[PDB]
Design a protein around this ligand. Structure first.
Ligand SMILES: *[C@@H]1O[C@H](CO)[C@@H](O[C@@H]2O[C@H](CO)[C@@H](O[C@@H]3O[C@H](CO)[C@@H](O)[C@H](O)[C@@H]3O)[C@H](O)[C@H]2NC(C)=O)[C@H](O)[C@H]1NC(C)=O
Ligand SMILES: *[C@@H]1O[C@H](CO)[C@@H](O[C@@H]2O[C@H](CO)[C@@H](O[C@@H]3O[C@H](CO)[C@@H](O)[C@H](O)[C@@H]3O)[C@H](O)[C@H]2NC(C)=O)[C@H](O)[C@H]1NC(C)=O
Ligand SMILES: *[C@@H]1O[C@H](CO)[C@@H](O[C@@H]2O[C@H](CO)[C@@H](O[C@@H]3O[C@H](CO)[C@@H](O)[C@H](O)[C@@H]3O)[C@H](O)[C@H]2NC(C)=O)[C@H](O)[C@H]1NC(C)=O
Ligand SMILES: CO[C@]1(C(=O)O)C[C@H](OC(C)=O)[C@@H](NC(C)=O)[C@H]([C@H](O)[C@H](O)CO)O1
Ligand SMILES: CO[C@]1(C(=O)O)C[C@H](OC(C)=O)[C@@H](NC(C)=O)[C@H]([C@H](O)[C@H](O)CO)O1
Ligand SMILES: CO[C@]1(C(=O)O)C[C@H](OC(C)=O)[C@@H](NC(C)=O)[C@H]([C@H](O)[C@H](O)CO)O1
Ligand SMILES: *[C@@H]1O[C@H](CO)[C@@H](O)[C@H](O)[C@H]1NC(C)=O
Ligand SMILES: *[C@@H]1O[C@H](CO)[C@@H](O)[C@H](O)[C@H]1NC(C)=O
Ligand SMILES: *[C@@H]1O[C@H](CO)[C@@H](O)[C@H](O)[C@H]1NC(C)=O
Ligand SMILES: *[C@@H]1O[C@H](CO)[C@@H](O)[C@H](O)[C@H]1NC(C)=O
Ligand SMILES: *[C@@H]1O[C@H](CO)[C@@H](O)[C@H](O)[C@H]1NC(C)=O
Ligand SMILES: *[C@@H]1O[C@H](CO)[C@@H](O)[C@H](O)[C@H]1NC(C)=O
Ligand SMILES: *[C@@H]1O[C@H](CO)[C@@H](O)[C@H](O)[C@H]1NC(C)=O
Ligand SMILES: *[C@@H]1O[C@H](CO)[C@@H](O)[C@H](O)[C@H]1NC(C)=O
Ligand SMILES: *[C@@H]1O[C@H](CO)[C@@H](O)[C@H](O)[C@H]1NC(C)=O
Ligand SMILES: *[C@@H]1O[C@H](CO)[C@@H](O)[C@H](O)[C@H]1NC(C)=O
Ligand SMILES: *[C@@H]1O[C@H](CO)[C@@H](O)[C@H](O)[C@H]1NC(C)=O
Ligand SMILES: *[C@@H]1O[C@H](CO)[C@@H](O)[C@H](O)[C@H]1NC(C)=O
Lengths: 328, 175, 328, 175, 328, 175
C-alpha cells in the first residue's frame, strides 16, 4: 500500500439542512400551526375591481336591464340586435315605458341571457280589422307617444275588434322565440273603449303547446300615470312547427321573432367598471386571476375561475420544517 | 417527522446555508468549511414542484349557472337554490382544507426523508472508516484533507484507500 | 484509565411497546379490520329522545300547525304575536275552522317559518258598502260563529256588493306580509246570495306585481258541514310600495300585516317532548350531542349539528397496533 | 407498518407495560427490570391528539334548509329535493369513510415510526459497545449495572467510559 | 469452536426487486406520469350496446310513450295493466289519437314511472243526463272513431248538459290515481253544440284539495284533422278520502283509477336493443359491467352502477415502480 | 420513494426475476444464483390487494332520480336540474382523481418500504460477518457455500458459527 501510513489524525463531517429566520406557519394532519421554510397561497382573495373586457364579450347594460332591452323600451333602443358573452346589468337600470310584469321573469331573463343574442327578425303578420301600432305617453318615443319597439298594440277599428286568428310557420332550421303579451285595463269602460268585447282572450299555440291568457280589469298603483299593466309571455316555435295567435281582444302582438342560439352566454349583476385588460375569470366584484385553485372573492363567477371556498387563506408548504440556528 | 432527521437527530437547521437545502460542514487538516449538496436539494425541490403543479392543474370553466343572490322572498324554489349552493360550498371548502392538510403533512415527511436518505448514503460510503456521532456527524478515523472531503461529497470516496489507517485508529488504541 | 476490571460481563437491553388484552378493530387503507390498542367513535348515533328547550327558542305548536296559527284558527289563538327559533309542528295538530286550501302551502309555510314571528299589526282598511266580519259555524269562536282572527269576510250590504278598491301604503322601513283569500261558493245561488255578482274577482297588486284570482263554484266534499272552500294567498309589500286590493265579490280581506324578519328561525315536524336542558343540535328524534363530527340519527337537523352520514359507526384509531404476547 | 418495528422486528407488545407506550426491559449485573420511555410515549400521544382535535374542529351550524320528508306525491320538484339530499349524503358518507381510512393508516405508521426512532436513538448512543440482536434487543458488551442502564434510558450514557472494555469483549475473544 | 480446516474466502449477496420491460404510467401526489410494474383501470368506459333484460323487468315501450300507454291511445292498448322496473321510451314513439297536452307532463310521467304499474280498476261512475263514450276520428279504434281507453268523453243529451256532481269514496287501503281532463273547443258554436253551456267548468276535489279548470275556446294548429285540444290532469285520492267531480260542460271523465305503488321503478329514454343477458347496471347506451368503481359511459343510470366521472381513464397502480435493466 | 431503496440505493430492478417481486442474487466460491423471496413478495401483494378490494367495495344502487337531458327550454327549474347534476359530477370526479393519486403515491412507498425491510432484515441476521457495499449487496466475510446462502435466505443463518472466521477476515488483515 504505502509503507507505515502513520498519520493518525481524524476528521469530522456533519450533515444538515437549511433554516430561514422568517418562515411560515402551515396546517397539517397532526398540527394546525407548524412552521415551514416556505409556503404558497392557494386562495385568491382580491379582485382588481374592474371587469376586464377581454377575452369574453362584455355588453354593459348601462341603464337597461336585459328584459327592457329585449322588449324595446325606447331608452334601450341602443341594444337592438346586440350580442354578448356576458350581459352586465347595473343597479341603476330603470324601466321607462308602459308598466308591465312578466309572470316568470326569472325564466325569461335566463332563457334570453344564455341565448346571447337580441337578433330580431320582423315578420309579416297581417292584422285585419284592428288598429295597429298603439302607443302610450308613458312610453314616449321622441316627443310623441310610443311603446316597446318589438311589440304591436292592437286596438279596435271603428266599432269592432274581430277575432284575430293568424299563423306563422317555422320554416327555417332554428328555434324562434316569440315574445307577446296581454293588456289589463283599469276599468270595464277602458276595456270596451279599446277592445269592444267586455272580456278579451289571447290563445297562442303551436302543435306542441297552448297558452290562453285572459286579461284582468282593475286598478293597480299609478305607475307612470297608469293603473293598467301589460303582462309579457313567450313562446318558442321549433323548426317545422307553426304559431297560431288567436284573440278576441287585449292582444299585445309580436312583430317577429328573436332567434335563439346555444352558447356560453350568461348575465351578471355588477356595478364594477369595465376596463381594457385580459382576464378569464369574472366576478361581480371585478375580474380575478385564476392562477390559484381556490378563491374567496365571490361565489358568482363566469369564465375559467378558481373554486369558491369559505376559507380566505390556505397555505401549501413548499419547503421543509424550519428549525432555526438561533433566528437571525 | 416520520424519519426523525429534521428536528430529530439533526438538532437544527443552518441559517448559514444559502446555496442549497441540504449539505455538509466539515472540520479538517486545512480547516472548517461548508457546502450544499445539490442532488438531494434538487430531489426535494422537484418533488415539491411536481406536487405544486398538480394542484394548479386546470381551473374548469363555467358559464350560465343558477342565481345565487335574490332580492324578493319566494319560498320553496328559492330555498332549494340557496341549499344547492350552500351545500356545494361546504363540500368544496372541506376538500380544500383536507387537501392542504394531507399535502403539508406529506411535504414535511418527504423533506425529512431526503435528509435521512443523504445521511444514509454518506454512511454507506464511509464503510468501516467512520463512526456516527449520533447528531448527524460522522467521526472519520483517518487523515482526511479537503480533497478527501470533496470525494465523500461528490460520491467518489474509496474506503479501501484508508481502511487500514481507519481500523487501526478506530479499534486498536488500547482495548 | 481505570484499572483491571477483573470481571467483564455483558448486559441485555430490549426495546418494546405496550399491548392491551382487549383492543379494537379499525379500518385502514390496506385492511378493513386491523386491531389497535384504542379507538374513538366519530358517528353520534343516539338521541336523548327530548328536544332541549335551550339555547334556541322552541315554540311547541301543540295542536296547531304554523299555518293555522298564522291564519288565526280559534283554537290556535294562543299563538298570536308569538316568536320562535324553531316551531315544532306535532303530528296531532288539526284544523278546526272554515275549510281552506293554500295554493303554494309549502312556500307560505317556509316563508313564515324562517321569518320567525307572528307579530300582527291591524290596519285601518275601510270597506264601504259591504258587511264586515262574516263568520261561520264551522269556525266556532266561543258559543257563536267565527272565522280566522286575522282575516275579514266581506259580504254584500242590502242589495249590493260595490267594487271595492282600497289602498294601504308601505311607509315603514320594513317588508309587510299580507295574507288574504277568496271564497269559492258551492252553488250559484250561494254566490249571488252573498256577493250579488254571479262571478266575483279579486285583484291584489303593488307597483311590482298583481294577482287576480277568480272564485270557482261547485261542490267539494263535506268538511265541517261545508262544501265551500276558501283559498289563501299572500303578498309582500316592500318599503315605499303600496297595496291596492280591488274586488267585485268573494274577497276574504286582510286585517293588517304580519311583519317579516330575517333570522335563523325554521320549523320542524317532531313528536319529541320538549325538556329543560341545553343542547345546540336538534333532530326530530330529540337533541343529540355535537361532540362527534358525524351523526346517524336523522338527516333533518337545526342548530350546530354533526354531519349526517350513512354509516353508524366509524372508529378513529387513537393508539398503535395491538400485538399481544399470550395466545388467544 | 412502514418502518417494520411494531409487529415487525419487535415480535409483540408487552401487556405488562402500564406506565407508558414504549419502553425498556433490561437484564444487567444487578438483576432484571422494565421502564416506560416517556419522551417517545408523549411524542406518539401528542401527535394522535393533535390529529384527533383537528377532526373535532367545528360542527358548522345550519338553520332553515329544504324539506326532506314529504307526505304527498308531487313529481318533478320533489324528485329534485330528494336527489339534492341523497347526493349530499352519499358525498359526505364518502368523505367520512375515506377520512378515517387515511387517518388510521397514518396513525399505525406514526406509532411504528416512533417505535423505530427510539430504537435508532438507543443504537446511536451505545456506539461500538453494543450489538443489535435483531429482535429489538442490544447485547451490551461491558459490565452495565443499574446506573449504567439508567443513563442509557435518560440519554446521558458516555460510550467512551466503556469503549475499551466493550471492544475487547466484543471483538478480541479468539478470532 | 467451528474449525475452518483450510478455506479462506468471502461471498456476495445482493438484494433486489423485479422490473418488467413493459410497465404502465400512473398519476401520483408528486408526479403525473410515473411508471409502475402494473396497474388496473378504475373507469368503466364502454357499453355492450344492449340493455340486458335481466335482473330488472324492462318494459319496451315500442312506439308508445308511457303517457300514451297510460291514457290509452288505441295503438298502445298492448300496455294495459302492464308493469316494469324500467320503462324504456323510444325515440320513435308517436301519439296517434285526439290531440292533448298535459300541463305538468313532467310530473305525471315521473309519478307514473316510479309507481311502476298501469293496473286499472274500472269504477261505476254514473253519469246521468249526458251522452257517454264520445269518440273522434283522430283516435280511430278499429275502422271506427274512438278515444283513450281509460277516459270517457261526455257530451249533452238531447238539449241539455246537466250539472254533473258525482262522488267515489276511497274505501280501500291504498292511494288511487285518477286521470281526468277537459275539452277545449275550437269555436263557440262547437262549445254549445257539444256542451250546451257557452262556458264549461270542471271542479275535481277531495277533502284535501280542489282543481277547477275552465276550458279555452280558440283555434290551435291542425293536428290530426283537429284544432281542438284536451288537457289532461290527475288527482290522487288517499285511503278514507273521497273524490267529488263536478262539471257543467267539457269534462273528459275518468273510468276508474290506476293504483299506485312504491318501488324501484323508473323510466329511461333509450334506443338501445334489449337482449337476453344479466346485468345490474343500465345506461341509455346499453348495460355496463359494475366491477369498476367509476364509469364514463353516461350520467344516466338505473340499477347498481359505477359512479359517473368526467375522466375516461384512471389507473390504480398495483405494483412497484418499474426501474428496468435496459430501457422502456 | 420514502425509503430510497427502489430506484434508490438499489440501482434498478431485475427483469430476470420472474418467480417473485423481491429476492436475492449471490456469488460464492461454489457458483452464482438468484432466488425470489416469497415472504416479502406476499406482504407487498397482500397489502396491494387489500387496498384494491376496499376500492371495489359496493357500487351503491340508485333507481328513479332526476331527468338529466331535456329537449325544450324551460328556464329557472331546468337550470337547477342541470346545476345539481353538474356540481355532483365535478365533486365525484374530484374524488376519483384525488383517490388514485393518494393511493398510487402510497403503493410506491409501500413497495419501497418492503424492499428496505427485507434489506434490513438480512442486515440484522448477518451481524458482524458481513459489510454493506452500499448498493444493496452485502460482502459476506467468510466461506459461504450454497447451504450457507440458503440459510440466510430462509432465515436460519447462525452468525456465531462463522463469527471468528468473519472477524479475522474482515478486520485483522494488516491494519
Ligand atoms: C282605485 O284606488 C287607487 C288607490 O286609492 C286609486 O289610485 C290612485 O289614483 C289617483 C287618481 O288617479 C292617483 O293620483 C295621481 O297621483 C300622481 C302622483 O301623486 C299625481 O301626479 C296625480 O296628480 C294624481 O294625484 C294616485 O297616484 C293613485 N294611487 C295609487 C297608489 O295608485 C285609483 O285611482 C282608484 N281607481 C278607481 C277607478 O277608483
Ligand atoms: C254533490 O255531490 C256530493 C257527493 O255526492 C254531495 O255531498 C254529500 O252531501 C250530503 C248532503 O249534504 C252530505 O250529507 C252529510 O253527511 C254527514 C255524515 O257524513 C251528515 O252528518 C250531514 O248531516 C249530511 O247528511 C254528504 O256528507 C256529502 N258527501 C260528500 C262526500 O261530500 C253534495 O251534497 C252534492 N251537492 C249538490 C248541490 O248536489
Ligand atoms: C285559424 O287559423 C289557422 C291558421 O291559419 C287555420 O288553420 C288551418 O286551417 C285549414 C283549414 O282547416 C287547415 O287545412 C287543412 O289542412 C289539412 C292538411 O293540409 C288538409 O287535409 C285539409 O284539406 C285542409 O287543407 C290547415 O292545416 C290549418 N293550418 C294550421 C297551421 O292549423 C284555422 O282553420 C283557422 N280557423 C278559423 C276558425 O278561422
Ligand atoms: C292615458 O292616456 C293614454 C296613455 O297611456 O298615455 C293615451 C294613449 O294613446 C296615446 C295618445 O298615446 C292610449 N293608447 C291607446 C292605444 O289607446 C292609452 C290607453 O288607452 C291606456 O293606456 C289603456 O290602459 O291611454
Ligand atoms: C252553512 O251556514 C253558514 C255557515 O257556514 O255556518 C252560516 C254562516 O253565517 C253564520 C250564522 O255564522 C254563513 N256566513 C256568511 C258570512 O254568510 C255561511 C256562508 O253563507 C257559507 O259558508 C258560504 O259558503 O253559511
Ligand atoms: C271533426 O269531427 C269529429 C271528430 O273529431 O272526428 C266527429 C266526432 O264524432 C265522431 C263521428 O266520431 C265528434 N265527437 C263528438 C263526441 O262530438 C268530434 C267533436 O265534435 C270535435 O272533436 C270537438 O272538438 O268531431
Ligand atoms: C416559496 O414557494 C413558492 C412556490 O414553490 C416559490 O415560488 C417561492 O420562490 C418560494 N420561496 C423561496 C424563497 O424559495
Ligand atoms: C336585425 O338583424 C336582422 C338580420 O340580419 C335584420 O334584417 C334587421 O333589420 C336588423 N335590425 C336592426 C335594427 O339592426
Ligand atoms: C365581493 O363582493 C361581495 C358582494 O358585493 C362582498 O360581500 C365581498 O366581501 C367582496 N369581496 C371582495 C374580495 O371584494
Ligand atoms: C471528486 O473530488 C475529487 C477531489 O476534488 C476530484 O479529483 C474528483 O474528480 C471529483 N469527482 C467528481 C465526479 O467531481
Ligand atoms: C382512547 O382514545 C380516546 C381518544 O384519544 C381517549 O379519550 C381514551 O382515554 C383512550 N383510551 C385509553 C384507555 O387511553
Ligand atoms: C301584537 O303586537 C302589536 C305590536 O306591538 C300590537 O299593537 C298588537 O296589539 C298585538 N296584538 C296582540 C294580540 O298581542
Ligand atoms: C330517528 O328517527 C327516524 C324517523 O323518525 C328513524 O327512522 C330513525 O331510525 C331514528 N334514529 C334514531 C337513532 O333515533
Ligand atoms: C441519568 O442516570 C444516572 C444514573 O441514575 C444519574 O446520575 C443521572 O443524573 C441521570 N440523568 C438525568 C438527566 O436523569
Ligand atoms: C395487475 O394488477 C391487477 C390487479 O391487481 C391483476 O389482476 C393483474 O394480474 C396484475 N398483472 C400482473 C401481470 O400481475
Ligand atoms: C286490469 O286488472 C284489474 C285487477 O285485477 C282487472 O279487474 C281488470 O279487468 C284488468 N283489465 C285488463 C285489460 O287487464
Ligand atoms: C353514451 O351515450 C351518449 C349519449 O347517447 C354519448 O354522447 C356518449 O359518448 C356515449 N358513450 C359511450 C361510451 O357509449
Ligand atoms: C434453511 O436452509 C438449510 C440449507 O438448505 C436447511 O438445512 C434448513 O433446513 C432450511 N430451513 C428451512 C426452515 O427451510
Amino acid at each position: 500500500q504505502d509503507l507505515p501510513g502513520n498519520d493518525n489524525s481524524t476528521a469530522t463531517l456533519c450533515l444538515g439542512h437549511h433554516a430561514v429566520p422568517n418562515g411560515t406557519l402551515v396546517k397539517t394532519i397532526t398540527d394546525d400551526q407548524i412552521e415551514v421554510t416556505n409556503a404558497t397561497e392557494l386562495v385568491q382573495s382580491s379582485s382588481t375591481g374592474k371587469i376586464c373586457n377581454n377575452p369574453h364579450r362584455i355588453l354593459d347594460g348601462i341603464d337597461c336591464t336585459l328584459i327592457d332591452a329585449l322588449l324595446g323600451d325606447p331608452h334601450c333602443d341602443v341594444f337592438q340586435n346586440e350580442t354578448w358573452d356576458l350581459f352586465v346589468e347595473r343597479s341603476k337600470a330603470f324601466s321607462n315605458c308602459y308598466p308591465y310584469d312578466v309572470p316568470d321573469y326569472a325564466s325569461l331573463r335566463s332563457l334570453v341571457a344564455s341565448s346571447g343574442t337580441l337578433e330580431f327578425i320582423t315578420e309579416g303578420f297581417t292584422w285585419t280589422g284592428v288598429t295597429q301600432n298603439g302607443g302610450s305617453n308613458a312610453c314616449k318615443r321622441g316627443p310623441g307617444s310610443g311603446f316597446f319597439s318589438r311589440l304591436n298594440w292592437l286596438t279596435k277599428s271603428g266599432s269592432t275588434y274581430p277575432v284575430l286568428n293568424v299563423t306563422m310557420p317555422n320554416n327555417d332550421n332554428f328555434d324562434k322565440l316569440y315574445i307577446w303579451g296581454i293588456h289589463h285595463p283599469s276599468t270595464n269602460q277602458e276595456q270596451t273603449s279599446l277592445y269592444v268585447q267586455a272580456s278579451g282572450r289571447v290563445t297562442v299555440s303551436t302543435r306542441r303547446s297552448q297558452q290562453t291568457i285572459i286579461p284582468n280589469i282593475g286598478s293597480r298603483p299609478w305607475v307612470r300615470g297608469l293603473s293598467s299593466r301589460i303582462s309579457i309571455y313567450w313562446t318558442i316555435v321549433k323548426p317545422g312547427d307553426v304559431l297560431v295567435i288567436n284573440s278576441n281582444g287585449n292582444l299585445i302582438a309580436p312583430r317577429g321573432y328573436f332567434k335563439m342560439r346555444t352558447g356560453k352566454s350568461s348575465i351578471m349583476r355588477s356595478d364594477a367598471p369595465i376596463d381594457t385588460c385580459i382576464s378569464e375569470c369574472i366576478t361581480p366584484n371585478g375580474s380575478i386571476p385564476n392562477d390559484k385553485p381556490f378563491q374567496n372573492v365571490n361565489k358568482i363567477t363566469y369564465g375559467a375561475c378558481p373554486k369558491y371556498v369559505k376559507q380566505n387563506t390556505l397555505k401549501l408548504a413548499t419547503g421543509m420544517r424550519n428549525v432555526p440556528e438561533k433566528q437571525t | 417527522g416520520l424519519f426523525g432527521a429534521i428536528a430529530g437527530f439533526i438538532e437544527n437547521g443552518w441559517e448559514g446555508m444559502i446555496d442549497g437545502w441540504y449539505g455538509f460542514r466539515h472540520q479538517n487538516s486545512e480547516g472548517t468549511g461548508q457546502a450544499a449538496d445539490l442532488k438531494s436539494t434538487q430531489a426535494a425541490i422537484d418533488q415539491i414542484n411536481g406536487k405544486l403543479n398538480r394542484v394548479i392543474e386546470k381551473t374548469n370553466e363555467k358559464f350560465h349557472q343558477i342565481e345565487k343572490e335574490f332580492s324578493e322572498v319566494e319560498g320553496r324554489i328559492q330555498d332549494l337554490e340557496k341549499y344547492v349552493e350552500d351545500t356545494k360550498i361546504d363540500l368544496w371548502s372541506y376538500n380544500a382544507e383536507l387537501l392542504v392538510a394531507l399535502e403539508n403533512q406529506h411535504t414535511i415527511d418527504l423533506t425529512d426523508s431526503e435528509m435521512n436518505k443523504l445521511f444514509e448514503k454518506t454512511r454507506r460510503q464511509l464503510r468501516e472508516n467512520a463512526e456516527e456521532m449520533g447528531n448527524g456527524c460522522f467521526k472519520i478515523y483517518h487523515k482526511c484533507d479537503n480533497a478527501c472531503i470533496e470525494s465523500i461529497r461528490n460520491g467518489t470516496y474509496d474506503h479501501d484507500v484508508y481502511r487500514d489507517e481507519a481500523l487501526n485508529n478506530r479499534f486498536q488504541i488500547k482495548g
